[PDB]
Design a protein around this ligand. Sequence first.
Ligand SMILES: COc1ccc(Cn2c(=O)n3ncnc3c3c4c(sc32)CN(C(=O)[C@@H]2CC2(F)F)CC4)cc1
Ligand SMILES: [Mg+2]
Ligand SMILES: [Zn+2]
Length: 323
Amino acid sequence: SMASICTSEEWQGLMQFTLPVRLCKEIELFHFDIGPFENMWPGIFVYMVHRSCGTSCFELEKLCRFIMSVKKNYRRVPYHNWKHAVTVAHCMYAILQNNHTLFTDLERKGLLIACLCHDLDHRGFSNSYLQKFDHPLAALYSTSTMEQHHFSQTVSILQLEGHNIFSTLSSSEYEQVLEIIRKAIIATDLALYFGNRKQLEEMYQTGSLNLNNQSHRDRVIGLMMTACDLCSVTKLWPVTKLTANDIYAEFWAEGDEMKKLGIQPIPMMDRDKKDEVPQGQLGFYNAVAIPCYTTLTQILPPTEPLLKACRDNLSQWEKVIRG
Ligand SMILES: COc1ccc(Cn2c(=O)n3ncnc3c3c4c(sc32)CN(C(=O)[C@@H]2CC2(F)F)CC4)cc1
Ligand SMILES: [Mg+2]
Ligand SMILES: [Zn+2]
């Protein structure tokens, strides 16, 4: 196969994890930072699945094997790594906990799994890089290159022995949840977000948005995926700052490769233009993050703490640009 497999040690150790009780109250908050609890991230995902979907939603042995093999199939890149996957999944947990009955049992188990899996086997390169330099992945996946690969890696991992946590769903539900996951992972291609958000904005603003319309439903799930994927801008400012360092470590490394290939990168991927990052952060908050959390909060009012935190980090960036 293409997917690596966890060891017996790794998935057996997971089964006996118990989350410290203090972290039970903290994990429910949107601003929660998994940062200082690395050893607990797999157990934190197990806990989140059990609160959202119930303690016997998956077979524990299959769930731990799945989680530890997902971990192993994230690479040690600066930003698109195992930490990012658990961070995105936790944001989804918080969204779902606060909007619990708006989503089906199938969607909640799908979206938590999709979030943990959404960057599987990321190489540290953008879709743009892969298609520009004719990476083999881009020959295989013409559009949303990495995201098609991530979903393909999710299916590979499910196909590993004893890994298929969804095999006890009905044949129909099995096929529905894999579709829920496929769309959710594809939706994390930020190139698709801008059109998705303008559509949602117009549906909401005209009163036509209807969560029981499946096409509207897919779009709302997609915006949730974006909101989760971007959620470093919803943490406390020192956490947001530290995560920015990882993001730009990965960007700059891409820009270093572009330079080697004789093609100057955009300033935000050029480490000799670090001075421009604060202004680029302001533009990203204004053009992307703020509209995303604003439209999400209009559709799902309980998600407002994300927008509040995002505005707060916008102001910090504005202070950087000033003093
Ligand atoms: C490293 O790979 C990625 C890809 C996507 C994300 C999603 N994302 C994100 O979560 N956060 N959080 C704070 N800021 C960003 C942010 C910004 C993006 S994407 C993005 C684009 N952008 C650039 O500077 C890029 C280089 C360029 F100009 F193309 C402005 C900032 C994160 C990391
Ligand atoms: Mg991605
Ligand atoms: Zn991501």
